[PDB]
């Protein structure tokens, strides 16, 4: 039986990509939505960025429920690591999260340093972090641009093993920019797991540039990833982080056990939509207005039975697909109702009652016609 | 080198799920957008549905460019097949598309017939189709609900081999409802390819209920699928069909050769958006308003270089990320401009010029401040 932790990064990766970043009270509202959704951990921010974010991280750390991992992000240097720890140490379960780049391009063309120097930086930063937080505290290390570490993939194994030996309990593998295809990333995850084994938790953090973040994250589980970093409503850099709802529902549909309160999905998404001013597209998976419609029939319980993965109510929505007597499906519905009661009426009579249904609907507006009165109208 | 055909089903699967189905002139406009996008084939409709759709299919068949496959969908019965052929026979390259269910549930609980009877129906319908279209004409067979053919997967191999032997040139594998995970579907595709080999083209047709249609379609290519059925703007049943743009761009980024005019992507999507009244979400991959923004820096060419898959212009968009002197990034931009010219100004002076930039922008509205005048303002 697989353990899969859903790690939310909305307050960090999501907030920082926002056209209109959140105030402290909005961040607190979002934090509370995350707690009620029962995610397995929450990254509250990047406290080194500025004094406001520092304050927010501290407030959220103290608000955090007991036993709920509270993470904050730091770059790989002693002073910033110390500041980060100061931000979160008051949380019941603080988690230190350190990032450093590991891709060939980053090392050769951005950092312009050797691989040996990279390993030294990784080891020194994680070791230092462990020196200030003590033994009981989870440390996560992210290899930035891991998804692009193609030419230096072997190095990447060394980097993560180094991080673990220095004290990292979680190795986070980001697909910082989505460039290829899920199984390219997933094969890399598999090879990392092959050398990490039980020495650390493998986490993944995928972005959605080619519309394949959910798939990449989901398939990573089946090669050994036990944590997925996600965001509400697919917020985050560019096209966004891995969508929390799609990932949670997909894993559930595949038989996995998650702590997520699935029925909080829709009320959460609606509120996040309001807080960001980003409407929920009507065809958006899980939460889209129109995704439970089965309309194709109009052109010619069975639809609900053979063509639905999960019910509206499962994600906290009301089922709005109610048989009506006032539309393109209106006419045939009256036929079926009359059939049920054993009332025989000609095709012209049905066409008649059809018009009466749309009539007494406009009067006392709109469209709320009962079977009982429709039976009374015919006979 | 892989051959991958992009087969558009917007005028069929897309149109029939539409809240407001298209008129003949709108269908013609959509058809023309598809031709200009240079998709490899177009399914024009379901001509058996009604006389209007029949007429539309005939009009589009005659409008179709030479050498462009024009498909229309039919259920697996002689009279409907004959009607369908009548609808499309005038196209330069007509393609007959027949569907019949193949999943355990469909056969046992919906059709309530034996597997032997299913094979007979498949063979008879394809053989009949071949009898009326002649040898030169492509026949596609779809096994409806293939993605759910888990308990009877072995049967599914028999069904497709039967279809091929009867005359099917293309075997289409739909993930009618997205229920699991890409690699479950993809493994099934692989096993079908293992027995079909070079006897027919494998096509896939995935839906997007769990947000993983693009991935499922893309990964299917790497186990032998040579045709992908897609729709503009992810139109189609429920959450929609596989999104054309994401699929085309992903395959291109993975080094594949497609005929798609990539630079038609954005103008097409914008027009389809208008025709359906479904806005393009600002975080939608490829075409979303906000997906080329790199904003996270504000919180503390490189961003464009290390964090972009493809350029805005590649998909027919204008790059709107222009360095401005009027915002939260405004102040530092003036610093850098003054640095370039070797003009030294105090931190208070920069703060001053910052205010002058926002001032002469409101006057003669709005926000269009040149470097040249900003240099003239400082010195
Ligand atoms: C800090 C890391 C995980 C990051 O956000 C990226 O690589 O996408
Ligand atoms: C006709 C077939 C391909 C169909 O639309 C479905 O199975 O999704
Ligand atoms: Zn990220
Ligand atoms: Zn379909």
XYZ file of C-alpha atoms and ligand atoms in Angstrom:
776
model
C 0.000 0.000 0.000
C 1.505 3.331 -1.174
C 1.823 6.390 1.066
C 1.191 9.572 -0.944
C 1.450 13.001 0.679
C -0.118 15.998 -0.983
C 2.128 19.019 -0.399
C 0.570 22.378 -1.177
C 2.721 25.232 -2.467
C -0.095 27.704 -3.317
C 1.131 30.241 -0.710
C 4.600 30.232 -2.274
C 4.812 29.197 -5.953
C 1.175 30.242 -6.498
C 1.184 33.568 -4.652
C 4.448 34.762 -6.188
C 3.151 34.312 -9.759
C -0.058 36.213 -8.927
C -0.863 39.451 -10.808
C -2.235 40.690 -7.471
C -0.346 39.033 -4.549
C -2.325 38.273 -1.393
C -2.561 40.350 1.759
C -1.880 38.662 5.116
C -5.611 38.107 5.778
C -6.097 36.558 2.316
C -3.090 34.283 2.927
C -4.646 33.261 6.252
C -7.934 32.540 4.495
C -6.095 30.393 1.911
C -4.128 28.615 4.667
C -7.413 27.781 6.434
C -8.886 26.387 3.191
C -5.815 24.151 2.882
C -6.201 22.888 6.463
C -9.892 22.096 5.806
C -8.953 20.347 2.543
C -6.644 18.230 4.735
C -3.520 18.472 2.592
C -0.581 16.679 4.194
C 1.667 19.736 4.398
C 1.754 23.411 3.505
C 4.610 25.555 2.200
C 3.802 28.963 3.674
C 6.277 31.126 1.761
C 9.790 32.306 0.973
C 10.541 34.298 4.178
C 13.947 35.596 3.006
C 12.263 37.551 0.176
C 11.161 40.504 2.360
C 9.913 41.446 5.841
C 6.224 41.047 4.960
C 6.641 37.457 3.761
C 8.809 36.819 6.829
C 5.953 38.032 9.063
C 3.336 36.017 7.203
C 5.393 32.816 7.545
C 5.711 33.401 11.312
C 1.961 34.057 11.751
C 1.031 30.958 9.731
C 3.638 28.855 11.595
C 1.946 29.698 14.914
C -1.549 29.184 13.476
C -0.616 25.766 12.055
C -2.374 22.707 13.544
C -0.270 20.259 15.553
C 1.373 17.541 13.444
C 0.944 19.429 10.138
C 4.263 19.967 8.275
C 4.868 23.688 7.636
C 7.527 24.348 5.016
C 9.303 27.497 3.890
C 11.709 27.876 1.002
C 15.326 29.039 1.228
C 18.215 29.289 -1.192
C 21.413 27.409 -0.333
C 23.338 29.803 1.892
C 23.834 29.958 5.651
C 22.360 33.401 6.423
C 19.206 32.838 4.393
C 18.812 29.372 5.930
C 19.062 30.890 9.445
C 16.423 33.559 8.591
C 14.123 30.848 7.196
C 14.440 28.803 10.389
C 13.605 31.884 12.448
C 10.461 32.267 10.329
C 9.109 28.732 10.938
C 10.659 27.367 14.156
C 7.474 28.079 16.138
C 5.349 25.723 14.006
C 4.546 22.405 15.683
C 6.163 20.620 12.710
C 8.495 22.967 10.822
C 10.079 21.706 7.614
C 13.162 23.367 6.103
C 13.148 23.458 2.277
C 16.362 24.262 0.445
C 16.786 24.582 -3.340
C 19.922 24.510 -5.516
C 20.213 24.011 -9.292
C 21.387 20.626 -10.660
C 20.941 20.775 -14.477
C 23.853 20.813 -16.954
C 22.850 24.244 -18.313
C 22.498 25.801 -14.835
C 25.910 24.567 -13.724
C 27.858 25.271 -16.940
C 26.157 28.438 -18.223
C 24.457 30.110 -15.273
C 26.523 29.250 -12.174
C 29.673 28.602 -14.257
C 31.217 26.352 -11.585
C 32.318 22.712 -11.512
C 30.213 19.729 -10.427
C 32.501 19.185 -7.419
C 31.747 22.771 -6.277
C 28.005 22.100 -6.703
C 28.235 19.007 -4.479
C 30.164 21.013 -1.882
C 27.499 23.734 -1.853
C 24.714 21.177 -1.494
C 26.455 19.275 1.306
C 27.448 22.465 3.152
C 23.992 24.048 2.984
C 22.107 20.918 4.114
C 24.684 20.149 6.831
C 24.425 23.725 8.114
C 20.619 23.521 8.090
C 20.789 20.308 10.131
C 23.205 22.044 12.560
C 20.610 24.715 13.389
C 17.342 22.715 13.330
C 18.492 19.591 15.208
C 17.723 15.873 14.580
C 13.913 15.850 14.833
C 13.261 18.201 11.926
C 12.466 17.317 8.301
C 14.752 18.856 5.694
C 13.710 18.864 2.040
C 16.188 19.433 -0.764
C 15.080 20.459 -4.282
C 17.403 20.065 -7.252
C 16.252 23.035 -9.323
C 15.853 22.243 -13.064
C 16.123 18.503 -12.430
C 13.717 17.916 -15.345
C 16.326 19.416 -17.691
C 19.286 17.468 -16.233
C 19.549 15.303 -19.352
C 23.254 15.534 -20.329
C 24.382 15.403 -16.680
C 21.815 12.933 -15.350
C 24.430 10.737 -13.634
C 25.635 13.821 -11.718
C 22.125 14.336 -10.461
C 22.263 10.983 -8.577
C 25.456 12.160 -6.858
C 23.837 15.489 -5.927
C 20.818 13.873 -4.281
C 22.820 11.194 -2.496
C 25.062 13.997 -1.197
C 22.016 15.929 0.056
C 20.643 12.828 1.833
C 23.966 11.980 3.490
C 24.212 15.605 4.700
C 20.758 15.311 6.315
C 17.988 15.671 3.709
C 14.934 13.583 4.592
C 13.039 14.491 1.414
C 14.457 14.798 -2.095
C 12.244 17.001 -4.296
C 12.482 16.565 -8.069
C 11.094 19.547 -9.963
C 10.104 19.682 -13.612
C 10.786 23.410 -13.414
C 9.849 23.927 -17.068
C 7.745 21.290 -18.843
C 9.753 20.566 -22.016
C 9.262 16.927 -23.002
C 6.809 14.194 -22.075
C 5.781 12.567 -18.796
C 7.695 9.307 -19.327
C 10.998 11.119 -19.928
C 10.628 12.830 -16.525
C 9.150 9.690 -14.960
C 12.047 7.497 -16.139
C 14.430 9.961 -14.436
C 12.382 9.786 -11.219
C 12.560 5.958 -11.414
C 16.370 5.981 -11.725
C 16.672 8.379 -8.771
C 14.431 6.075 -6.702
C 16.614 3.110 -7.744
C 19.614 4.680 -5.958
C 17.816 6.494 -3.107
C 15.734 3.428 -2.139
C 14.482 3.922 1.459
C 17.091 6.565 2.388
C 14.703 9.461 1.752
C 11.217 10.345 0.522
C 11.038 11.222 -3.187
C 8.859 14.283 -3.874
C 8.012 15.726 -7.298
C 7.158 19.271 -8.323
C 6.011 19.623 -11.932
C 4.905 22.647 -13.956
C 2.257 22.712 -16.641
C 3.742 24.389 -19.758
C 2.644 21.591 -22.117
C -0.579 20.705 -20.221
C 0.929 17.495 -18.801
C 1.769 18.341 -15.139
C -1.051 16.195 -13.617
C -0.019 13.155 -15.660
C 3.667 13.598 -14.899
C 2.941 13.842 -11.166
C 0.480 10.924 -11.155
C 2.817 8.602 -13.085
C 5.743 9.528 -10.790
C 3.865 7.846 -7.914
C 4.036 4.540 -9.797
C 7.825 4.659 -9.874
C 8.193 5.475 -6.148
C 7.365 9.147 -5.472
C 5.614 9.516 -2.092
C 5.025 13.290 -2.140
C 3.486 15.542 -4.792
C 3.783 19.331 -4.718
C 0.608 20.942 -6.048
C -1.366 24.177 -6.020
C -5.011 25.114 -5.718
C -6.690 25.898 -9.056
C -3.376 25.225 -10.846
C -1.897 28.525 -9.650
C 1.883 28.974 -9.957
C 4.566 30.015 -12.442
C 3.372 30.487 -16.052
C 0.711 27.836 -16.860
C 0.959 26.888 -13.179
C 1.901 24.128 -10.779
C 0.342 20.667 -10.833
C -3.371 21.106 -10.166
C -4.298 19.802 -6.690
C -7.815 18.657 -7.632
C -6.970 16.723 -10.791
C -4.052 15.009 -9.052
C -6.055 14.073 -5.942
C -9.058 12.786 -7.924
C -6.862 10.854 -10.413
C -4.959 9.102 -7.609
C -8.233 8.288 -5.823
C -9.761 6.897 -9.040
C -6.657 4.715 -9.418
C -7.323 3.162 -6.000
C -4.883 5.189 -3.896
C -5.580 6.344 -0.344
C -5.332 10.085 0.223
C -6.133 12.209 3.253
C -7.732 14.900 1.051
C -11.283 15.943 1.905
C -12.540 15.506 -1.677
C -15.890 17.120 -0.911
C -14.113 20.390 -0.079
C -12.768 20.575 -3.667
C -15.460 22.663 -5.327
C -16.144 25.173 -2.496
C -12.375 25.689 -2.226
C -11.910 26.249 -5.969
C -14.818 28.699 -6.127
C -13.340 30.770 -3.278
C -9.796 30.664 -4.746
C -11.297 31.777 -8.058
C -12.809 34.826 -6.316
C -9.530 35.607 -4.481
C -7.486 35.553 -7.704
C -10.048 36.931 -10.158
C -9.342 33.930 -12.409
C -12.687 32.395 -13.478
C -13.078 28.611 -13.471
C -13.339 27.634 -17.170
C -16.602 25.782 -17.910
C -14.658 22.827 -19.389
C -12.008 22.652 -16.616
C -11.708 19.043 -15.325
C -13.365 18.254 -11.936
C -14.702 21.763 -11.258
C -15.812 23.164 -14.649
C -19.447 24.299 -14.896
C -20.219 22.176 -17.969
C -18.263 18.921 -17.351
C -21.250 16.850 -16.139
C -23.342 17.651 -19.221
C -24.241 14.861 -21.628
C -25.678 16.822 -24.531
C -24.669 14.836 -27.614
C -27.974 12.893 -27.537
C -30.027 15.977 -28.503
C -28.612 15.588 -32.031
C -30.153 12.204 -32.885
C -29.099 7.437 -16.222
C -27.288 5.523 -18.952
C -25.108 8.592 -19.640
C -24.488 9.023 -15.895
C -23.638 5.313 -15.499
C -21.334 4.662 -18.470
C -19.797 8.125 -18.990
C -18.959 9.478 -15.506
C -15.821 8.840 -13.435
C -17.118 10.334 -10.151
C -20.320 12.119 -9.050
C -20.765 15.926 -8.737
C -21.460 15.448 -5.029
C -18.139 13.639 -4.525
C -16.293 16.930 -5.142
C -18.816 19.120 -3.305
C -20.999 20.163 -6.247
C -24.753 19.867 -6.725
C -25.934 17.660 -9.610
C -27.730 20.099 -11.936
C -28.553 17.591 -14.704
C -32.322 17.516 -14.089
C -34.773 16.269 -16.740
C -36.811 19.271 -17.916
C -39.938 19.656 -20.062
C -38.976 23.036 -21.541
C -36.211 22.427 -24.124
C -34.930 20.321 -27.064
C -35.181 17.391 -24.642
C -38.565 18.659 -23.326
C -40.790 16.931 -25.903
C -39.454 13.393 -25.460
C -39.580 13.768 -21.661
C -43.363 14.365 -21.784
C -43.671 11.229 -23.963
C -41.806 9.172 -21.350
C -43.792 10.594 -18.391
C -47.093 9.832 -20.126
C -45.758 6.342 -20.926
C -45.004 5.742 -17.226
C -48.550 6.619 -16.133
C -50.046 4.652 -19.054
C -51.648 7.749 -20.589
C -51.945 7.552 -24.379
C -51.763 10.822 -26.321
C -51.208 11.473 -30.048
C -47.987 13.022 -31.393
C -49.874 16.291 -31.971
C -51.138 16.246 -28.372
C -47.562 15.844 -27.077
C -46.507 18.812 -29.247
C -49.418 20.720 -27.692
C -48.516 19.937 -24.074
C -44.919 20.817 -24.963
C -46.053 24.385 -25.750
C -48.160 24.571 -22.559
C -45.079 23.562 -20.519
C -42.973 26.446 -21.910
C -45.954 28.805 -21.494
C -46.716 28.414 -17.764
C -42.932 28.567 -17.243
C -42.485 32.092 -18.684
C -45.437 33.129 -16.516
C -44.071 32.812 -12.960
C -40.543 32.758 -14.446
C -38.836 30.515 -15.169
C -38.893 26.836 -16.276
C -40.072 24.910 -13.179
C -42.741 22.485 -14.466
C -43.731 19.461 -12.347
C -44.793 16.034 -13.632
C -47.909 16.114 -11.425
C -49.379 19.188 -13.147
C -48.274 17.954 -16.588
C -50.288 14.782 -15.906
C -53.198 17.024 -14.825
C -52.811 19.044 -18.054
C -53.048 15.974 -20.320
C -55.961 14.316 -18.495
C 11.299 8.705 -38.159
C 7.682 8.571 -36.881
C 4.678 9.577 -38.989
C 2.062 11.311 -36.820
C -1.241 12.487 -38.294
C -3.331 15.026 -36.452
C -7.006 14.169 -36.966
C -9.460 16.880 -35.991
C -12.889 15.961 -34.638
C -14.031 19.479 -33.595
C -16.922 19.461 -36.119
C -18.228 16.198 -34.662
C -17.251 15.433 -31.042
C -16.768 19.160 -30.342
C -19.883 20.536 -32.035
C -22.216 17.933 -30.545
C -21.187 18.789 -26.961
C -21.699 22.519 -27.610
C -24.304 24.440 -25.562
C -25.004 26.337 -28.797
C -24.310 24.084 -31.846
C -22.928 25.749 -34.973
C -24.838 26.920 -38.019
C -23.654 25.785 -41.467
C -21.698 29.028 -42.042
C -19.981 28.712 -38.641
C -19.088 25.086 -39.443
C -17.637 26.267 -42.764
C -15.631 28.928 -40.944
C -14.302 26.281 -38.515
C -13.522 23.902 -41.406
C -11.519 26.675 -43.109
C -9.563 27.337 -39.890
C -8.703 23.626 -39.774
C -7.498 23.649 -43.395
C -5.301 26.702 -42.665
C -3.964 25.008 -39.513
C -2.991 22.155 -41.867
C -4.376 19.282 -39.809
C -3.929 15.951 -41.577
C -7.628 15.090 -41.709
C -11.014 16.407 -40.655
C -14.066 14.561 -39.340
C -16.926 16.704 -40.635
C -19.829 15.189 -38.701
C -22.269 12.385 -37.965
C -24.491 12.619 -41.098
C -26.986 9.942 -39.971
C -28.038 12.127 -37.006
C -30.385 14.394 -39.021
C -30.864 16.067 -42.417
C -29.023 19.262 -41.446
C -25.851 17.420 -40.423
C -26.207 15.316 -43.579
C -26.267 18.516 -45.670
C -23.332 20.050 -43.827
C -21.207 16.923 -44.374
C -21.982 17.029 -48.118
C -21.126 20.753 -48.415
C -17.852 20.304 -46.510
C -16.998 17.169 -48.544
C -17.208 19.204 -51.769
C -15.320 22.151 -50.252
C -12.503 19.892 -49.016
C -9.045 20.380 -50.588
C -7.681 17.578 -52.767
C -5.764 14.910 -50.832
C -7.233 15.894 -47.434
C -8.975 12.969 -45.648
C -12.614 13.840 -44.860
C -14.186 11.535 -42.293
C -17.745 11.084 -41.080
C -18.951 8.890 -38.251
C -21.447 6.030 -38.532
C -22.739 3.363 -36.191
C -22.292 -0.273 -37.228
C -25.314 -1.006 -39.399
C -25.763 -1.231 -43.160
C -28.373 1.505 -43.732
C -26.556 4.092 -41.636
C -23.262 3.167 -43.316
C -24.860 3.691 -46.764
C -26.252 7.121 -45.713
C -22.815 8.112 -44.374
C -21.155 7.165 -47.663
C -23.721 9.231 -49.556
C -22.775 12.175 -47.329
C -19.014 12.063 -48.056
C -18.463 10.249 -51.377
C -17.926 13.545 -53.230
C -14.863 14.480 -51.144
C -11.548 13.996 -52.944
C -10.453 11.678 -50.104
C -13.470 10.367 -48.182
C -12.837 8.274 -45.083
C -15.529 6.021 -43.591
C -15.493 5.897 -39.766
C -17.440 3.174 -37.996
C -17.787 2.739 -34.215
C -18.887 -0.270 -32.138
C -18.431 -0.903 -28.400
C -15.739 -3.368 -27.221
C -15.587 -3.072 -23.390
C -16.692 -5.845 -21.002
C -19.411 -3.643 -19.460
C -20.808 -2.553 -22.852
C -21.046 -6.122 -24.119
C -22.363 -7.783 -20.934
C -24.567 -5.039 -19.459
C -25.525 -2.688 -22.279
C -25.638 -4.784 -25.474
C -26.216 -8.027 -23.517
C -24.834 -10.206 -26.332
C -21.923 -12.639 -26.602
C -18.387 -11.821 -27.758
C -18.874 -14.001 -30.854
C -21.908 -11.854 -31.810
C -19.810 -8.696 -31.303
C -17.124 -10.017 -33.670
C -19.802 -10.888 -36.231
C -21.258 -7.373 -36.058
C -17.825 -5.797 -36.448
C -16.843 -8.015 -39.381
C -20.221 -7.597 -41.111
C -20.314 -3.809 -40.769
C -16.730 -3.249 -41.982
C -17.116 -5.796 -44.806
C -20.339 -4.101 -45.918
C -18.658 -0.684 -45.790
C -15.831 -2.005 -47.978
C -18.448 -3.438 -50.397
C -19.909 0.030 -51.027
C -16.786 2.250 -50.962
C -14.422 0.055 -53.011
C -10.684 -0.720 -52.529
C -9.175 2.784 -52.670
C -10.993 4.172 -49.642
C -9.759 4.394 -46.038
C -11.995 2.776 -43.434
C -11.484 3.572 -39.753
C -12.896 1.391 -37.002
C -13.299 2.652 -33.410
C -13.761 0.229 -30.531
C -15.978 2.355 -28.295
C -14.982 2.243 -24.583
C -11.668 0.561 -25.393
C -10.097 2.411 -22.437
C -12.430 0.494 -20.105
C -11.846 -2.923 -21.737
C -9.865 -4.152 -18.727
C -11.503 -7.512 -17.851
C -11.934 -8.436 -21.535
C -8.696 -6.981 -22.898
C -7.755 -10.167 -24.789
C -11.120 -9.982 -26.599
C -10.252 -6.497 -27.726
C -7.281 -7.851 -29.762
C -9.667 -10.248 -31.521
C -12.120 -7.416 -32.252
C -9.498 -5.198 -33.879
C -7.875 -8.006 -35.841
C -11.371 -8.911 -37.079
C -11.988 -5.300 -38.153
C -8.652 -5.170 -40.025
C -9.225 -8.482 -41.817
C -12.690 -7.236 -42.869
C -11.113 -4.103 -44.392
C -10.279 -1.534 -41.691
C -7.186 0.497 -42.576
C -7.182 2.451 -39.306
C -7.916 1.109 -35.831
C -9.007 3.906 -33.467
C -8.587 3.346 -29.726
C -10.727 5.703 -27.660
C -10.354 6.501 -23.980
C -14.055 7.341 -24.030
C -14.053 8.240 -20.330
C -10.750 9.063 -18.614
C -10.778 6.791 -15.538
C -7.211 5.774 -14.703
C -3.764 7.002 -15.679
C -1.962 7.458 -18.996
C 0.299 4.400 -18.670
C -2.646 2.046 -18.087
C -4.175 3.208 -21.396
C -0.754 3.409 -23.057
C 0.159 -0.165 -22.065
C -3.092 -1.314 -23.724
C -2.223 0.645 -26.883
C 1.232 -1.024 -26.867
C -0.276 -4.532 -26.669
C -2.686 -3.739 -29.519
C 0.249 -2.486 -31.623
C 2.149 -5.699 -30.780
C -0.525 -7.763 -32.583
C -1.572 -5.272 -35.294
C 2.034 -4.514 -36.337
C 1.965 -3.008 -39.870
C -1.517 -4.330 -40.756
C -3.222 -1.031 -39.919
C -2.629 2.464 -38.547
C -3.255 2.804 -34.799
C -5.192 5.974 -33.911
C -6.084 7.162 -30.401
C -8.977 9.287 -29.192
C -8.743 10.316 -25.539
C -11.028 12.424 -23.348
C -9.968 14.763 -20.586
C -12.000 13.913 -17.441
C -8.926 13.722 -15.179
C -6.903 16.423 -17.016
C -4.587 13.846 -18.624
C -5.803 13.570 -22.268
C -2.769 15.391 -23.800
C -0.319 13.162 -21.928
C -2.196 9.981 -22.777
C -2.246 10.912 -26.472
C 1.402 12.033 -26.542
C 2.676 8.890 -24.789
C 0.608 6.666 -27.126
C 2.805 7.864 -30.018
C 5.834 6.329 -28.291
C 4.239 2.889 -28.322
C 3.234 3.038 -32.017
C 0.163 5.266 -32.501
C 0.410 7.173 -35.808
C -2.826 9.187 -35.572
C -4.213 11.363 -32.777
C -7.815 12.576 -32.689
C -8.009 16.064 -31.193
C -10.209 19.145 -31.016
C -9.648 22.876 -31.167
C -9.610 24.575 -27.749
C -10.240 21.185 -26.091
C -13.889 21.170 -27.180
C -15.777 17.858 -26.966
C -17.713 15.686 -24.517
C -17.570 16.806 -20.856
C -14.065 18.178 -20.089
C -13.401 17.745 -23.815
C -11.305 15.908 -26.364
C -7.510 15.985 -26.420
C -6.476 19.600 -26.955
C -5.016 20.099 -30.457
C -2.555 22.841 -29.464
C -1.015 21.166 -26.422
C -0.637 17.892 -28.322
C 0.917 19.507 -31.410
C 3.338 21.675 -29.400
C 4.326 18.788 -27.067
C 5.106 16.480 -30.003
C 7.087 19.252 -31.726
C 9.061 19.968 -28.530
C 9.859 16.243 -28.343
C 11.447 16.402 -31.806
C 8.562 15.047 -33.889
C 7.668 16.300 -37.363
C 4.115 17.561 -37.768
C 2.388 19.265 -40.674
C 0.607 21.687 -38.306
C 1.017 25.398 -39.006
C 2.019 26.221 -35.412
C 1.828 29.966 -36.004
C -1.900 29.649 -36.740
C -2.492 28.323 -33.189
C -3.305 31.540 -31.357
C -5.428 33.278 -34.050
C -7.390 30.027 -34.409
C -7.975 29.650 -30.660
C -9.082 33.274 -30.305
C -11.650 32.854 -33.100
C -12.901 29.489 -31.745
C -13.235 31.154 -28.343
C -15.496 33.815 -29.900
C -17.556 31.190 -31.795
C -18.214 29.144 -28.640
C -18.401 31.927 -26.051
C -15.853 30.004 -23.960
C -13.096 32.429 -22.862
C -9.465 31.309 -23.027
C -8.354 31.001 -19.370
C -5.349 33.242 -18.618
C -3.351 30.233 -17.332
C -4.314 27.853 -20.188
C -1.153 26.224 -21.649
C 0.122 27.591 -25.019
C -2.598 30.224 -25.498
C -3.350 31.638 -22.016
C -2.958 35.413 -21.610
C -0.613 35.154 -18.614
C 1.594 32.111 -19.436
C 4.634 34.101 -20.651
C 4.811 36.198 -17.474
C 7.799 35.824 -15.170
C 6.647 37.782 -12.140
C 8.169 35.938 -9.182
C 11.250 38.220 -9.248
C 9.250 41.270 -8.083
C 9.157 39.658 -4.620
C 12.898 39.712 -3.874
C 16.370 37.631 -20.759
C 17.500 35.094 -18.173
C 13.844 34.259 -17.412
C 13.092 34.027 -21.151
C 16.157 31.812 -21.739
C 15.940 29.306 -18.870
C 12.168 29.224 -18.241
C 10.491 29.140 -21.683
C 9.785 26.100 -23.874
C 8.823 28.024 -27.046
C 8.406 31.715 -27.971
C 5.072 33.627 -28.098
C 5.674 34.246 -31.801
C 6.018 30.509 -32.485
C 2.286 30.072 -31.776
C 1.209 33.330 -33.436
C 1.195 35.612 -30.386
C 2.955 38.925 -29.811
C 5.533 39.018 -26.994
C 4.066 41.518 -24.508
C 6.777 41.169 -21.832
C 8.307 44.631 -22.338
C 10.494 46.277 -19.674
C 8.570 49.271 -18.303
C 9.508 52.199 -16.050
C 6.068 52.571 -14.450
C 5.619 49.675 -11.980
C 7.139 47.541 -9.177
C 9.859 46.734 -11.721
C 9.982 50.400 -12.877
C 12.521 51.653 -10.315
C 15.235 49.061 -10.957
C 14.827 49.496 -14.730
C 15.767 53.201 -14.467
C 18.836 52.160 -12.424
C 19.916 49.758 -15.181
C 19.301 52.273 -18.012
C 21.349 54.931 -16.216
C 24.057 52.303 -15.614
C 24.202 51.542 -19.358
C 24.755 55.195 -20.305
C 27.238 55.669 -17.433
C 25.066 58.283 -15.712
C 25.476 58.308 -11.927
C 22.457 59.332 -9.847
C 21.752 58.908 -6.112
C 19.103 56.492 -4.795
C 16.856 59.480 -4.015
C 17.287 60.786 -7.573
C 16.214 57.400 -8.991
C 13.137 57.493 -6.721
C 12.478 60.986 -8.101
C 12.737 60.014 -11.776
C 10.542 57.012 -10.955
C 7.731 59.414 -9.975
C 8.292 61.567 -13.090
C 7.949 58.433 -15.265
C 4.513 57.562 -13.809
C 3.502 61.243 -14.028
C 4.050 61.959 -17.748
C 2.408 58.564 -18.374
C -0.964 59.467 -16.789
C -0.824 62.684 -18.820
C -1.174 61.464 -22.426
C -2.466 58.134 -21.049
C -1.052 55.655 -20.479
C 2.385 54.218 -19.538
C 4.526 54.688 -22.682
C 7.841 56.135 -21.427
C 10.946 55.958 -23.649
C 14.552 55.536 -22.489
C 15.636 58.531 -24.596
C 13.439 61.007 -22.695
C 14.241 59.353 -19.348
C 17.927 59.995 -20.111
C 16.977 63.595 -21.003
C 15.064 63.884 -17.699
C 18.046 62.799 -15.568
C 20.660 64.910 -17.378
C 11.829 25.616 -5.580
C 11.536 24.702 -6.767
C 10.865 23.383 -6.393
C 10.785 25.397 -7.895
O 9.799 26.017 -7.622
C 10.970 24.860 -9.320
O 11.950 24.253 -9.619
O 9.839 24.719 -10.120
C -16.725 7.598 -31.784
C -15.734 7.457 -30.631
C -14.270 7.575 -31.044
C -16.045 8.368 -29.451
O -16.236 9.530 -29.667
C -15.582 7.924 -28.058
O -15.399 6.773 -27.817
O -14.984 8.872 -27.232
Zn 7.969 25.612 -9.036
Zn -15.103 10.989 -28.218
